[PDB]
Design a protein around this ligand. Structure first.
Ligand code: ZN
Ligand code: ZN
Ligand code: ZN
Lengths: 96, 213, 213
């Protein structure tokens, strides 16, 4: 249910010292030596919520990697009540 | 857009007010009766306009099916909430509406029964063609109208629960559901009104002579 | 719109890092110093774009005066609230920003004093023209930067109370006010950077010979 496209052989090559704000929100190819890496963490991908008033599990929503997503309507209680994320039904992707 | 109305007339049979049955609901039919009460011409919400409460963008031409409805689509991409709206009365489109109460004719009344009444709704050009105290033939659709009166009546009254079979639930903790009554009374929505003479069988004479052949 | 920067140079006098006084804040001036630390080139919020939280319409090109600001005008007629906004980073406009730390030169240091440092900000084309361990002459404006460090220092620190003389009040019932500290340290914002030789008085030879007359 997901295909990631890997762009190869981007022509322009930037060094890390010459990155400016014009490169922001744009594609960049840079060279470098890896110094340290973190552990692999689960990041929310298809987020599933449950309403505390009703207990029903509300349908999954795709999570943007840029920002946190939130929910305000229940569709079963028709309420803006406290919604909790349950990790049992939530789908995750790897993050490093 | 001009609102068009089709008026049917000259139905082969005219039905008595006591011949009204539940199988004719939603069907074209003709009734006759004596007009006893008529109401003021009023506006009815035909094509409403709403604004989503947090989007605050305008939408229009939402159809109203008898009792007042609100849209849940909201094609504006700003919101993620469907239920919350507000309605403005100025941008909304309206239709003419009149409720006239009719009664059983004297010869139509059974042997020991009291006369029974019926509220028939006139819309558009049919409004104000009925006057108190005359016999009118209405052609229209037999409709059904919500009625809270039938609460204390004997017999099982149909109710309407929301079915919960395909909803996944968890007992996480912190069980309420809504049920609505299905109680109704038969009404009439007349597209055509013709006034039969109150007898068994306009001041200017030039107007009167033009009607005669 | 293109962001234009004016770089002034060849000022008649160059000031030592210890000659910096509060009278020169907001004035064009030249300093010299040894670059000890340089930072990564970073984006600075020049012209931000916000959306009002309940209007949810976009506005842009709001100028930023050093510390982060939010507009209170909101020319959208939908809201009646000025304070509540949110900022998007993608539609915003940014600038080069580099903080380089400079130190007193060895000959400029007084008889028994330790060397003192100064953080000077480079923007636009002036970034990365300063390298650790060389003597640089910076021309720019002496600016002032908020500093929470001065809390425990002796002496009266200026504070900023809101004045309440033209506000009508009632003691209806159901007295809190906000005061902020005015504590600052002197910094430099250099429009021009020139690197004096670290000595008292580019690998290709064709590049080198072109520089010489
Ligand atoms: Zn719920
Ligand atoms: Zn909406
Ligand atoms: Zn606003």
């Amino acid at each position: 249910s997901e295909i990631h496209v890997r762009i190869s052989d981007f022509p322009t090559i930037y060094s890390l010292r010459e990155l400016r704000e014009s490169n922001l929100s744009s594609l960049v190819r840079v060279t470098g030596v890896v110094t340290r890496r973190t552990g692999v963490f689960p990041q929310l991908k298809y987020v599933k919520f449950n309403c505390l008033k009703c207990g029903s599990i509300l349908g999954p929503f795709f999570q943007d990697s840029n920002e946190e997503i939130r929910i305000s309507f229940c569709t079963n209680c028709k309420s803006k009540g406290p919604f909790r994320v349950n990790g049992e039904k939530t789908v995750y992707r790897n993050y490093q | 857009e001009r609102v068009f109305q089709i008026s049917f007339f000259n139905l082969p049979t005219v039905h008595r007010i006591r011949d009204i049955r539940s199988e004719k609901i939603g069907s074209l039919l003709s009734i006759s009766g004596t007009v006893t009460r008529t109401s003021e011409v009023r506006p009815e919400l035909y094509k409403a306009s709403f604004t989503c409460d947090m989007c605050r963008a305008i939408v229009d031409n939402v159809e109203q099916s008898f009792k007042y409805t609100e849209p849940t689509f909201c094609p504006n991409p700003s919101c993620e909430n469907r239920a919350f709206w507000t309605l403005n009365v100025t941008r909304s489109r309206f239709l003419d509406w009149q409720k006239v109460r009719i009664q059983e004719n004297a010869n139509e009344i059974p042997t020991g029964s009291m006369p029974r009444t019926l509220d028939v709704i006139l819309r558009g050009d049919s409004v104000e063609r009925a006057k108190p105290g005359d016999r009118c033939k209405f052609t229209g659709v037999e409709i059904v109208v919500p009625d809270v009166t039938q609460l204390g009546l004997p017999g099982v009254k149909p109710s309407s629960t929301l079915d919960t079979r395909g909803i996944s639930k968890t007992t996480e903790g912190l069980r309420s559901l809504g049920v609505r009554d299905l109680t109704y009374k038969i009404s009439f929505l007349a597209c055509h009104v013709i006034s039969i003479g109150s007898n068994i069988g306009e001041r200017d004479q030039e107007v009167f002579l033009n009607s005669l052949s």
